């Protein structure tokens, strides 16, 4: 049961827990309940992370950290 | 649009291919809607074969200023095939075929709920291979890049509306077939921190992984340069 990893600047949560193909098989009648349930648990954790960030009020704003996932630019650096 | 130190939001161009059918067009319309307002689409078909001639994609990317493209084709061999393409300096960066399984669901298959357009999405990725397998790492990079929208330092709590969820269809050992990737979109609800509940809004897509094109090491260095 590894801990979830967060990239809060991208509002993203990463879950490396074991997944069982029998729970998610296209013929499994409860596959969507299982997918939604997993997503719901990870969204709860993500929201809890986001809501513990420093906040401003101008309406309430979170101060997101810089995104950490390495994503390619669309154009070369000037 | 000239290069910038802080880049614009990536724009996506959806391209019906010659063999695009009605089902595929409906999928395209609903998935492209999620990328609004940073989205363009062609109304007519184009005869594109990405793995035999990438040239028309590079021209489209430059002409329409879209560094993200999705081509829609279908054959008996590759049914409901969505080829996702990213460019760097308008040249092909990577491509991957993601073929939509027959169990897909459209927006119309879910009870209509209000949906504010243009909000930044949350993401949850379920599956260890998204961090360690070269194919699933590309898929995670692609979908974050594709849908994350505007980068911001201030996030409005009230705009935390929906989540894009991507799940690998079970763990797998090397040598086994690569499992499908399960794409889901949910809107948040809550009740009293509150307990979050989710309601699916669609589209619901199961992607079967096809062929890939990856960048040379030189291009990687260029594209990821700080």
Numbering used by the authors:
A (entry chain B): 16 to 73, 87 to 106
B (entry chain A): 19 to 210, 218 to 251
Quote the passages of the study that discuss this structure, keeping the authors' original sentences.
The 5' region of pre-rRNA that consists of the 5' external transcribed spacer (5' ETS), 18S rRNA and the internal transcribed spacer 1 (ITS1) is co-transcriptionally packed into a terminal ball of ~40 nm in size. These particles represent the earliest assembly intermediates of 40S and are known as the 90S pre-ribosome or the SSU processome. Within 90S, the pre-rRNA is cleaved at sites A0 and A1 in the 5' ETS and site A2 in the ITS1, yielding a 20S pre-rRNA intermediate. The fully assembled 90S contains an unprocessed pre-18S rRNA, U3 snoRNA, approximately 51 assembly factors and 18 r-proteins with a molecular mass of 5.0 megadaltons.
The EM densities were docked with the available crystal structures of yeast 40S ribosome and AFs or homology models of AFs.
